[PDB]
Amino acid sequence: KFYIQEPPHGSPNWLKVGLTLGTSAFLWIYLIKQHNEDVLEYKRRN
Amino acid sequence: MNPIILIIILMTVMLGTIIVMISTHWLLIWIGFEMNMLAIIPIMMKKHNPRATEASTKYFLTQSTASMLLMMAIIINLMFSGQWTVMKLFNPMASMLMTMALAMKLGMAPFHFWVPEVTQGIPLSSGLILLTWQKLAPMSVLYQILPSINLDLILTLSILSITIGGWGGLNQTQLRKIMAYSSIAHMGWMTAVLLYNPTMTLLNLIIYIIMTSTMFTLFMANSTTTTLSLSHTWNKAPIMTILVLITLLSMGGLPPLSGFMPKWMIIQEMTKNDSIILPTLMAITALLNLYFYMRLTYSTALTMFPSTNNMKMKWQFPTTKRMTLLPTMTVLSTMLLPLTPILSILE
Amino acid sequence: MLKYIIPTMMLMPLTWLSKNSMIWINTTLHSLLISLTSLLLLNQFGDNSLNFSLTFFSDSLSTPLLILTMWLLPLMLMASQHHLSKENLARKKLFISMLILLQLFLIMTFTATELIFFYIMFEATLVPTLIIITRWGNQTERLNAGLYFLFYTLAGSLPLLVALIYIQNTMGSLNFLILQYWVQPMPNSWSNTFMWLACMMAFMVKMPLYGLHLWLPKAHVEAPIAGSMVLAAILLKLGGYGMMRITLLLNPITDFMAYPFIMLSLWGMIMTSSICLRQTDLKSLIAYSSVSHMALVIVAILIQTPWSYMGATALMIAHGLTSSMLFCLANSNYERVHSRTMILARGLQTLLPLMAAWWLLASLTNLALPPSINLIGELFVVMSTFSWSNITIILMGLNMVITALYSLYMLITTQRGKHTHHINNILPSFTRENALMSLHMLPLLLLSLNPKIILGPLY
Amino acid sequence: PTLRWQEDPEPEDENLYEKNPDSHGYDKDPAVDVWNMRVVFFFGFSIVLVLGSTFVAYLPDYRMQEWARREAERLVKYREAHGLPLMESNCFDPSKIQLPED
Amino acid sequence: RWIARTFFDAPEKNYERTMAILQIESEKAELRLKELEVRRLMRAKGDGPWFQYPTIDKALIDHSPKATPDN
Amino acid sequence: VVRDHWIHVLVPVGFVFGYYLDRKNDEKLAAFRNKSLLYKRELKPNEEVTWK
Amino acid sequence: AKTLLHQYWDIPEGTECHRKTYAATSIGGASGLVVSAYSVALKTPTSFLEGVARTGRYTFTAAAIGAIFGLTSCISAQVREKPDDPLNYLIGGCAGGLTLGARTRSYGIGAAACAYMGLTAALVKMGQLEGWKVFAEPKV
Amino acid sequence: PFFDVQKKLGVDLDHWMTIQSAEQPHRIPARCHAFEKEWIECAHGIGSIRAEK
Amino acid sequence: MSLVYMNIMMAFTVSLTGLLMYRSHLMSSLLCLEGMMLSLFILATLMILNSHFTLASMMPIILLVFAACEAALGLSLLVMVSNTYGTDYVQNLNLLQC
Amino acid sequence: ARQWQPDVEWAEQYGGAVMYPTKETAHWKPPPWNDVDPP
Amino acid sequence: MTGRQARAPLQFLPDEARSLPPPKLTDPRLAYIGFLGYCSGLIDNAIRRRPVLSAGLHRQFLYITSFVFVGYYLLKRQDYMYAVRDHDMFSYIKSHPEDFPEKDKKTYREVFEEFHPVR
Amino acid sequence: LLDLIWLETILPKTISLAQMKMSTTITSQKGLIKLYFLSFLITILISTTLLNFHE
């Protein structure tokens, strides 16, 4: 429908979007755990 | 020009710059500059036109005589107090020859006669890699040998570099010669601070490399060599217009935009000495080297030149390149005014 | 003051994600609400200033200019259709967002605690105006006008930065109180003279004075109405604001070194009032009028009397309102006839019966009508300069005579006597233009009732 | 044998009348023109101008004027009832001064 | 009175704000001038830990019995 | 009323946010609460405050 | 160079005259030799006798600027008897600019050279008089 | 920049070609050995300016 | 001051001027660069020999192998220049102008 | 459409290899658009 | 300015930087970095001709996360650098009493100035 | 006379013509390499023996 020689993208892939969401959730959880351990280290040392 | 061979040659450019940075011995400094030359010659002549051949010839002769002058200065250094350490030198003649070698290596105004010629007859990827890496790597060496330099050398070459890279530049309609003269002006702006606080020099290097990457990416998105092609890229797509606007006005160095953090912090840690006439002269020449940016902008995105058709045919086909990293470098190069206390990221 | 900074930011994506033919109503309504909230500022009392941070603070000099900026925004944002109402949706949104960003940097600039921050937001005000006048200049020398604007205002304004860095690292911080409460006299050396000449000459470029005033008229006759009114009113009165703040330092040497600038300002005020008597190009008369009145402002700032500073800020605010309105009437007549000239568009007493009242009332507020604020400013400047010298009042009154002459000639030239009877396209006056005229005039008369607001620090 | 251009013969003068005779200032949409007129004359006059006139018509005593009146009345009554001249000069007490000698 | 009650601020609030803010920025100005004086004397004499450009590391200097007796 | 048209709610809530954050800055800068030599009375009647 | 500008600023100014004009001829001849060396290195005037002509022309004009600058500096210092104000070097720079315009045979270039050489000579006088460390502390 | 991956990895790639008084292949001296040993042990932990003075 | 160092530095400046001023040829310029390479080699080698500085005797051999492959690159570029023309003059490079 | 736009001859000035022609810079021909010199 | 105890590896942040308090979440600088990331994502949807404010929300979230993460570590480095600058400054103040004397705070009862009236 | 013709000659025109003439003297270089290396050589000599940089 509507497209001679159907577009190479636009039809959504399913590896790259899941990879980006997975690494972004991983990066948020890592920085939150890093920040909480840093706050607990600051309150331990002081 | 196989992709394996290109990955190998770019890896050798990376390796040459790392060997320049990482060693505490003069032989690896010379080997790093030399391997950087030997690898950066076949990034040029990626085409086969005689333009790239003559450009690589000019670059090879100037680059090689700079390398031999460097080796002369190092052998004079071992004629005096004898060790191969990267520190304070022990001869004003040796430091004289070495600063002139690095001045030929990265371009000063008695030495810059190879820069617009070698940037004219090459494609944009080769110009990008030579500007970024060839003006990155010897700044490390000057940063290492800064406590033993006669000041008149650096400062005369820097003043003259800023004023000649300004004056030469109001007469070129080519893009690459404009960018080369801008490179000469920014080499002068980095060099004039180097005996006072070198954190400003390395931060100005970071800012100029990000600006040049944005500029050459906005010229890689649409193959242009003259400003008439820039007006046709006004006609084909509107976002390239406003980004050429913002990156040209950030090359100019206007205060709300992030091209003012290099100039103004240099003014600060220049005038915390008793040098005032030299900052006002340098910054009036910084007023001077904005005019060709501004006529470039008037050609691109403020007035509208009449465009040939077949843009009617080009409209069906979207700009389907891949950019290296255009939007991140754009917003980091232009919207980074209020993070000036990332100055102290560097020590 | 953050309660005024952040809704100016929030009014920007308003314009983007409002739909077609609804960006206008939302932006006008919300900027008028910002104007009411701006008028709620006026709290300033007696002994100190008011501090809206170690970052923001308001003198009573900055209060009426700030309310003037946030009042001149919606007036302009309504003033700038019918010459871009046929253009694209994206370019229209870009223009409106550019005006909002220019308001943002003007608020940044008027509530600038530090002089470094003042310089950065000064040239941040300088940035979008070039883009506005070049992209919508509607004439063929808009490139020349924007380029002269740029290089004049930078190349004058630039060693001011070097002088401010030198004061920054010879006397500590640059809050206006700790620049104050600590300021020591600076004797008649030569380096102090060059520091004074750098700072005062940067603002001399910005006002302008006579030797540097061709900066201005191209940037008004070759510019749209939005850039023209903001340029004239807020940028020139911002330059005067900046000189008022920075002249607290360098106390002794201004008597030694401030005679030739007084001179060039007075004789060029006379020559500029003379040059705007015989010109065509109706837009340019108000431009040279602005040059004359800001030369009067410059004489008022460089003499250092409290009467002079009260008269200076009153003259600033009154002339900002009058010249912005008179620019807007000139654009109204240019939208009636695509001329820009003066001897062509004749008649207009018979036709357009209501527009005569606005022309007459704006010409009388330019005439220094005596209960108005313009005569209050000019009168206190005349009092202070006759205290300065007993002989300079001749130039002031000769300026007064020629000012009345050219203003009333500008009235009786375009709108008095005979239609040229080959025009036959002019429509009766819209409600929009008269709404703009009523938004200009009525605050000026209501300040003429109670001018204890607009008199500045030395009330 | 040349023209050097290809664009439209321009322009047509947009008479904003002759399609809406009841029109307000700007273009030919009937409803939003009425909404613009209503919002500029309500939220520009009826809530801005008149309420601003009442707000800065009277407020706390701006730059401390009537307080200065009443304090001066009290202080002139005091300094006239206690012999000394009103506004004695030398506002800083010459007991609390130390001149450099000669 | 209602305008002063519902919108404005006391002169006590603003007055103590001014006084605290002058205390803060007086600390800032004194630290800035002391910074540049420390920097100029530390560059002049070199006794401080800032301007110490790296000299020879003596850990590689390894004294040992050589070949030639007179070194 | 909100999700019908949510565009007109933007800048009044922005102003309320800015006013709240100016009050938060004023609470942050609450040194010299009763250490001025002029505005200094004994604390009264109930709880600990004279401006906030 | 440094040694002959030190020869110029060794003289009390003041008057120890025609030592001043001799040192100023040395300054002008050195500067003209610099400019002639670059302008024969980057142009190659074809031929060598015309190269000698261009070098002699540039050196004679720059030495004439220096000589007349030094003479009118000496004369203004002897007449006004005030070794302090830079207005004597203002007159000096204007005389040098007018003789530059006399050699190049263009009057507007001579007027502009009068203005800028007078301003720069007064600035160099005030830099030596008040004391302005150009190029360097190089300390902090 | 003077990056010190040289020191971080613990690899003595560039500390043997560098100076005299190192470990020569056969344990032999130089011509001016003890002069550099005394000079380096004078100027070891010194900030390169009072090392001059 | 080891008098031979004086004449070898003199020979270095001679080869440097022969590199810099050169007429209508590139092979002679590259060959003078090779002579300058030989000058640096001999000067550094006499220094390392007279100083008994034995572990850093790699400077002459590594200097000369690296600058020899520089000369090889320069010869390949000269052959490319003479391939895209008939000759290898300093003339006929006048295109790609400044 | 009543807004001025730059004409053909306004962009003819942005031609040649240089911007300001003099008595010595006339021979600067514009570069080929392919960056390919003809053999 | 250089080492400052040149044992000194490449060392993006030492263990001594865990003694100063870490930067808080929703400090205004990292919120500005998040806004700059959102504008980066908006303009990345604008470079290619995909529609703005849609069709890239995983890329929007990736850009915001990457910029906030990197800016968090750079802010921790900034705090470390300013702390060690102040520590070295006050150590040099304490280590040299001679060059930094107590200035005689002469009150304005006995400090004379010039006047120069503007008439 | 005073504003237009003289003031537009004294502030814009003289500066703009100075920049134009200096640009047409600097960038007007034909591409011969012998000239560039002779410039390098006379720069080295003028930095060694005339205006000293090793002293």
PDB file of all heavy atoms in Angstrom, chain B residues 49 51 170-171 173 226 228 295 304-306, chain J residues 5-6 14 16 18-20 31-33 35 37:
ATOM      1  N   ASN B  49      42.405  12.815  -8.463  1.00  0.00           N
ATOM      2  CA  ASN B  49      42.660  14.060  -9.156  1.00  0.00           C
ATOM      3  C   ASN B  49      44.056  14.591  -8.827  1.00  0.00           C
ATOM      4  O   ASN B  49      44.610  14.287  -7.770  1.00  0.00           O
ATOM      5  CB  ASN B  49      41.581  15.071  -8.778  1.00  0.00           C
ATOM      6  CG  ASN B  49      41.360  15.155  -7.283  1.00  0.00           C
ATOM      7  OD1 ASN B  49      42.018  14.470  -6.503  1.00  0.00           O
ATOM      8  ND2 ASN B  49      40.424  16.003  -6.873  1.00  0.00           N
ATOM      9  N   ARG B  51      44.786  17.559  -8.025  1.00  0.00           N
ATOM     10  CA  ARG B  51      44.655  18.478  -6.898  1.00  0.00           C
ATOM     11  C   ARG B  51      45.137  17.838  -5.603  1.00  0.00           C
ATOM     12  O   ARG B  51      45.954  18.418  -4.878  1.00  0.00           O
ATOM     13  CB  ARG B  51      43.201  18.920  -6.756  1.00  0.00           C
ATOM     14  CG  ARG B  51      42.672  19.728  -7.915  1.00  0.00           C
ATOM     15  CD  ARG B  51      43.338  21.075  -7.927  1.00  0.00           C
ATOM     16  NE  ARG B  51      42.881  21.934  -9.011  1.00  0.00           N
ATOM     17  CZ  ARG B  51      41.882  22.800  -8.902  1.00  0.00           C
ATOM     18  NH1 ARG B  51      41.227  22.919  -7.758  1.00  0.00           N
ATOM     19  NH2 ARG B  51      41.541  23.548  -9.939  1.00  0.00           N
ATOM     20  N   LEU B 170      38.997  37.521   4.100  1.00  0.00           N
ATOM     21  CA  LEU B 170      37.945  38.399   3.624  1.00  0.00           C
ATOM     22  C   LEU B 170      37.870  38.424   2.109  1.00  0.00           C
ATOM     23  O   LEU B 170      37.232  39.316   1.541  1.00  0.00           O
ATOM     24  CB  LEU B 170      38.155  39.814   4.156  1.00  0.00           C
ATOM     25  CG  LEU B 170      38.197  39.918   5.676  1.00  0.00           C
ATOM     26  CD1 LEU B 170      38.413  41.350   6.110  1.00  0.00           C
ATOM     27  CD2 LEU B 170      36.945  39.356   6.274  1.00  0.00           C
ATOM     28  N   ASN B 171      38.511  37.468   1.445  1.00  0.00           N
ATOM     29  CA  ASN B 171      38.625  37.509  -0.004  1.00  0.00           C
ATOM     30  C   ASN B 171      38.424  36.128  -0.614  1.00  0.00           C
ATOM     31  O   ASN B 171      38.719  35.939  -1.800  1.00  0.00           O
ATOM     32  CB  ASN B 171      39.995  38.084  -0.381  1.00  0.00           C
ATOM     33  CG  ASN B 171      40.023  38.710  -1.758  1.00  0.00           C
ATOM     34  OD1 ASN B 171      39.024  38.722  -2.474  1.00  0.00           O
ATOM     35  ND2 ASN B 171      41.174  39.254  -2.128  1.00  0.00           N
ATOM     36  N   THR B 173      35.753  33.003  -1.482  1.00  0.00           N
ATOM     37  CA  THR B 173      34.404  32.467  -1.569  1.00  0.00           C
ATOM     38  C   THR B 173      34.366  30.954  -1.425  1.00  0.00           C
ATOM     39  O   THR B 173      33.276  30.390  -1.288  1.00  0.00           O
ATOM     40  CB  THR B 173      33.765  32.852  -2.898  1.00  0.00           C
ATOM     41  OG1 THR B 173      34.515  32.267  -3.967  1.00  0.00           O
ATOM     42  CG2 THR B 173      33.764  34.356  -3.058  1.00  0.00           C
ATOM     43  N   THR B 226      31.072  25.877  -2.611  1.00  0.00           N
ATOM     44  CA  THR B 226      30.898  27.316  -2.726  1.00  0.00           C
ATOM     45  C   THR B 226      29.619  27.730  -2.013  1.00  0.00           C
ATOM     46  O   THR B 226      28.769  26.900  -1.685  1.00  0.00           O
ATOM     47  CB  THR B 226      30.825  27.754  -4.189  1.00  0.00           C
ATOM     48  OG1 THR B 226      29.645  27.200  -4.781  1.00  0.00           O
ATOM     49  CG2 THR B 226      32.046  27.275  -4.964  1.00  0.00           C
ATOM     50  N   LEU B 228      27.139  29.367  -3.234  1.00  0.00           N
ATOM     51  CA  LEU B 228      25.962  29.185  -4.073  1.00  0.00           C
ATOM     52  C   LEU B 228      25.326  27.828  -3.808  1.00  0.00           C
ATOM     53  O   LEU B 228      24.090  27.697  -3.761  1.00  0.00           O
ATOM     54  CB  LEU B 228      26.347  29.317  -5.547  1.00  0.00           C
ATOM     55  CG  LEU B 228      26.703  30.686  -6.141  1.00  0.00           C
ATOM     56  CD1 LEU B 228      28.137  31.118  -5.845  1.00  0.00           C
ATOM     57  CD2 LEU B 228      26.449  30.689  -7.636  1.00  0.00           C
ATOM     58  N   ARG B 295      29.170  37.192   6.260  1.00  0.00           N
ATOM     59  CA  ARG B 295      28.762  37.149   4.858  1.00  0.00           C
ATOM     60  C   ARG B 295      28.436  35.728   4.420  1.00  0.00           C
ATOM     61  O   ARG B 295      27.579  35.538   3.546  1.00  0.00           O
ATOM     62  CB  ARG B 295      29.827  37.760   3.948  1.00  0.00           C
ATOM     63  CG  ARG B 295      31.141  37.036   3.948  1.00  0.00           C
ATOM     64  CD  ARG B 295      32.140  37.654   3.019  1.00  0.00           C
ATOM     65  NE  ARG B 295      31.816  37.386   1.630  1.00  0.00           N
ATOM     66  CZ  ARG B 295      32.355  38.043   0.616  1.00  0.00           C
ATOM     67  NH1 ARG B 295      33.227  39.012   0.857  1.00  0.00           N
ATOM     68  NH2 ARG B 295      32.017  37.741  -0.625  1.00  0.00           N
ATOM     69  N   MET B 304      18.005  35.022   0.617  1.00  0.00           N
ATOM     70  CA  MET B 304      17.700  33.804  -0.126  1.00  0.00           C
ATOM     71  C   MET B 304      18.083  34.001  -1.585  1.00  0.00           C
ATOM     72  O   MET B 304      17.416  34.746  -2.306  1.00  0.00           O
ATOM     73  CB  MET B 304      16.223  33.442  -0.010  1.00  0.00           C
ATOM     74  CG  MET B 304      15.817  32.988   1.367  1.00  0.00           C
ATOM     75  SD  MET B 304      15.339  34.294   2.506  1.00  0.00           S
ATOM     76  CE  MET B 304      13.655  34.582   1.971  1.00  0.00           C
ATOM     77  N   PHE B 305      19.146  33.332  -2.020  1.00  0.00           N
ATOM     78  CA  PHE B 305      19.556  33.443  -3.408  1.00  0.00           C
ATOM     79  C   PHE B 305      18.587  32.661  -4.290  1.00  0.00           C
ATOM     80  O   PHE B 305      18.002  31.672  -3.847  1.00  0.00           O
ATOM     81  CB  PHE B 305      20.974  32.912  -3.602  1.00  0.00           C
ATOM     82  CG  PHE B 305      22.041  33.770  -2.995  1.00  0.00           C
ATOM     83  CD1 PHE B 305      23.317  33.271  -2.820  1.00  0.00           C
ATOM     84  CD2 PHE B 305      21.778  35.073  -2.608  1.00  0.00           C
ATOM     85  CE1 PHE B 305      24.303  34.047  -2.265  1.00  0.00           C
ATOM     86  CE2 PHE B 305      22.758  35.853  -2.050  1.00  0.00           C
ATOM     87  CZ  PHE B 305      24.021  35.339  -1.879  1.00  0.00           C
ATOM     88  N   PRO B 306      18.375  33.099  -5.531  1.00  0.00           N
ATOM     89  CA  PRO B 306      17.487  32.345  -6.416  1.00  0.00           C
ATOM     90  C   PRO B 306      18.147  31.052  -6.844  1.00  0.00           C
ATOM     91  O   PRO B 306      19.324  31.021  -7.208  1.00  0.00           O
ATOM     92  CB  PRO B 306      17.272  33.292  -7.600  1.00  0.00           C
ATOM     93  CG  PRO B 306      18.472  34.142  -7.617  1.00  0.00           C
ATOM     94  CD  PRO B 306      18.873  34.324  -6.183  1.00  0.00           C
TER      95      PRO B 306
ATOM     96  N   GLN J   5      14.252  40.353  -2.394  1.00  0.00           N
ATOM     97  CA  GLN J   5      15.145  39.211  -2.359  1.00  0.00           C
ATOM     98  C   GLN J   5      16.325  39.481  -3.277  1.00  0.00           C
ATOM     99  O   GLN J   5      16.196  40.253  -4.232  1.00  0.00           O
ATOM    100  CB  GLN J   5      14.409  37.932  -2.780  1.00  0.00           C
ATOM    101  CG  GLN J   5      13.399  37.513  -1.751  1.00  0.00           C
ATOM    102  CD  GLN J   5      14.054  37.212  -0.425  1.00  0.00           C
ATOM    103  OE1 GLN J   5      15.107  36.577  -0.369  1.00  0.00           O
ATOM    104  NE2 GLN J   5      13.450  37.690   0.652  1.00  0.00           N
ATOM    105  N   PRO J   6      17.495  38.904  -2.989  1.00  0.00           N
ATOM    106  CA  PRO J   6      18.665  39.180  -3.828  1.00  0.00           C
ATOM    107  C   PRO J   6      18.528  38.572  -5.213  1.00  0.00           C
ATOM    108  O   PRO J   6      18.074  37.440  -5.376  1.00  0.00           O
ATOM    109  CB  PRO J   6      19.820  38.551  -3.044  1.00  0.00           C
ATOM    110  CG  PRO J   6      19.190  37.542  -2.191  1.00  0.00           C
ATOM    111  CD  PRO J   6      17.857  38.087  -1.819  1.00  0.00           C
ATOM    112  N   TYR J  14      29.407  37.038  -5.919  1.00  0.00           N
ATOM    113  CA  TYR J  14      30.029  35.935  -5.190  1.00  0.00           C
ATOM    114  C   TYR J  14      30.540  34.873  -6.156  1.00  0.00           C
ATOM    115  O   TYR J  14      30.277  33.683  -6.005  1.00  0.00           O
ATOM    116  CB  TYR J  14      29.041  35.337  -4.196  1.00  0.00           C
ATOM    117  CG  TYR J  14      28.618  36.260  -3.070  1.00  0.00           C
ATOM    118  CD1 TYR J  14      27.497  35.974  -2.305  1.00  0.00           C
ATOM    119  CD2 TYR J  14      29.333  37.416  -2.773  1.00  0.00           C
ATOM    120  CE1 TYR J  14      27.103  36.811  -1.281  1.00  0.00           C
ATOM    121  CE2 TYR J  14      28.940  38.260  -1.758  1.00  0.00           C
ATOM    122  CZ  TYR J  14      27.827  37.950  -1.013  1.00  0.00           C
ATOM    123  OH  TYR J  14      27.436  38.786   0.005  1.00  0.00           O
ATOM    124  N   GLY J  16      33.858  33.730  -9.194  1.00  0.00           N
ATOM    125  CA  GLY J  16      35.297  33.674  -9.340  1.00  0.00           C
ATOM    126  C   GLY J  16      35.946  33.005  -8.142  1.00  0.00           C
ATOM    127  O   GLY J  16      35.295  32.537  -7.211  1.00  0.00           O
ATOM    128  N   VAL J  18      38.270  34.609  -6.210  1.00  0.00           N
ATOM    129  CA  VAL J  18      38.458  35.621  -5.187  1.00  0.00           C
ATOM    130  C   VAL J  18      37.220  36.502  -5.139  1.00  0.00           C
ATOM    131  O   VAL J  18      36.344  36.436  -6.001  1.00  0.00           O
ATOM    132  CB  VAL J  18      39.715  36.472  -5.428  1.00  0.00           C
ATOM    133  CG1 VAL J  18      40.951  35.599  -5.413  1.00  0.00           C
ATOM    134  CG2 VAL J  18      39.593  37.217  -6.737  1.00  0.00           C
ATOM    135  N   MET J  19      37.162  37.337  -4.106  1.00  0.00           N
ATOM    136  CA  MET J  19      36.043  38.246  -3.911  1.00  0.00           C
ATOM    137  C   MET J  19      36.301  39.618  -4.518  1.00  0.00           C
ATOM    138  O   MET J  19      35.425  40.177  -5.184  1.00  0.00           O
ATOM    139  CB  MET J  19      35.738  38.382  -2.421  1.00  0.00           C
ATOM    140  CG  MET J  19      34.614  39.332  -2.152  1.00  0.00           C
ATOM    141  SD  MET J  19      33.099  38.760  -2.923  1.00  0.00           S
ATOM    142  CE  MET J  19      32.243  40.319  -3.143  1.00  0.00           C
ATOM    143  N   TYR J  20      37.490  40.173  -4.297  1.00  0.00           N
ATOM    144  CA  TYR J  20      37.825  41.506  -4.784  1.00  0.00           C
ATOM    145  C   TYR J  20      38.821  41.394  -5.929  1.00  0.00           C
ATOM    146  O   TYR J  20      40.012  41.145  -5.690  1.00  0.00           O
ATOM    147  CB  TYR J  20      38.413  42.356  -3.656  1.00  0.00           C
ATOM    148  CG  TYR J  20      37.486  42.570  -2.490  1.00  0.00           C
ATOM    149  CD1 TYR J  20      37.661  41.863  -1.310  1.00  0.00           C
ATOM    150  CD2 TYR J  20      36.453  43.492  -2.558  1.00  0.00           C
ATOM    151  CE1 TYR J  20      36.826  42.059  -0.232  1.00  0.00           C
ATOM    152  CE2 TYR J  20      35.609  43.694  -1.485  1.00  0.00           C
ATOM    153  CZ  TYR J  20      35.802  42.972  -0.324  1.00  0.00           C
ATOM    154  OH  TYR J  20      34.967  43.167   0.749  1.00  0.00           O
ATOM    155  N   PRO J  31      37.237  27.150  -9.460  1.00  0.00           N
ATOM    156  CA  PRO J  31      37.647  25.750  -9.511  1.00  0.00           C
ATOM    157  C   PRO J  31      36.581  24.889 -10.168  1.00  0.00           C
ATOM    158  O   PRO J  31      35.391  25.257 -10.194  1.00  0.00           O
ATOM    159  CB  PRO J  31      37.823  25.386  -8.026  1.00  0.00           C
ATOM    160  CG  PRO J  31      36.897  26.276  -7.324  1.00  0.00           C
ATOM    161  CD  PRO J  31      36.896  27.546  -8.084  1.00  0.00           C
ATOM    162  N   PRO J  32      36.968  23.752 -10.752  1.00  0.00           N
ATOM    163  CA  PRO J  32      35.967  22.834 -11.297  1.00  0.00           C
ATOM    164  C   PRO J  32      35.107  22.219 -10.201  1.00  0.00           C
ATOM    165  O   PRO J  32      35.576  21.916  -9.104  1.00  0.00           O
ATOM    166  CB  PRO J  32      36.808  21.768 -12.012  1.00  0.00           C
ATOM    167  CG  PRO J  32      38.129  21.823 -11.327  1.00  0.00           C
ATOM    168  CD  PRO J  32      38.341  23.254 -10.964  1.00  0.00           C
ATOM    169  N   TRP J  33      33.824  22.060 -10.514  1.00  0.00           N
ATOM    170  CA  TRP J  33      32.834  21.673  -9.529  1.00  0.00           C
ATOM    171  C   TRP J  33      32.952  20.212  -9.131  1.00  0.00           C
ATOM    172  O   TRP J  33      32.461  19.824  -8.061  1.00  0.00           O
ATOM    173  CB  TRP J  33      31.448  21.982 -10.080  1.00  0.00           C
ATOM    174  CG  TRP J  33      31.257  23.451 -10.317  1.00  0.00           C
ATOM    175  CD1 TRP J  33      31.569  24.148 -11.447  1.00  0.00           C
ATOM    176  CD2 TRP J  33      30.701  24.401  -9.406  1.00  0.00           C
ATOM    177  NE1 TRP J  33      31.256  25.474 -11.290  1.00  0.00           N
ATOM    178  CE2 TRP J  33      30.723  25.655 -10.043  1.00  0.00           C
ATOM    179  CE3 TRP J  33      30.191  24.313  -8.108  1.00  0.00           C
ATOM    180  CZ2 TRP J  33      30.244  26.809  -9.434  1.00  0.00           C
ATOM    181  CZ3 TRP J  33      29.725  25.458  -7.502  1.00  0.00           C
ATOM    182  CH2 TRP J  33      29.753  26.690  -8.164  1.00  0.00           C
ATOM    183  N   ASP J  35      35.907  18.851  -8.649  1.00  0.00           N
ATOM    184  CA  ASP J  35      37.279  18.789  -8.122  1.00  0.00           C
ATOM    185  C   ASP J  35      38.142  17.823  -8.932  1.00  0.00           C
ATOM    186  O   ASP J  35      38.968  17.088  -8.391  1.00  0.00           O
ATOM    187  CB  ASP J  35      37.307  18.428  -6.632  1.00  0.00           C
ATOM    188  CG  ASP J  35      36.748  19.528  -5.753  1.00  0.00           C
ATOM    189  OD1 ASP J  35      36.850  20.712  -6.133  1.00  0.00           O
ATOM    190  OD2 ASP J  35      36.205  19.205  -4.675  1.00  0.00           O
ATOM    191  N   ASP J  37      40.563  17.851 -12.327  1.00  0.00           N
ATOM    192  CA  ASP J  37      41.163  18.623 -13.403  1.00  0.00           C
ATOM    193  C   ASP J  37      41.221  17.785 -14.679  1.00  0.00           C
ATOM    194  O   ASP J  37      41.538  16.594 -14.624  1.00  0.00           O
ATOM    195  CB  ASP J  37      42.561  19.090 -13.019  1.00  0.00           C
ATOM    196  CG  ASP J  37      42.534  20.185 -11.975  1.00  0.00           C
ATOM    197  OD1 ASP J  37      41.545  20.944 -11.940  1.00  0.00           O
ATOM    198  OD2 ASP J  37      43.502  20.291 -11.194  1.00  0.00           O
TER     199      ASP J  37
END
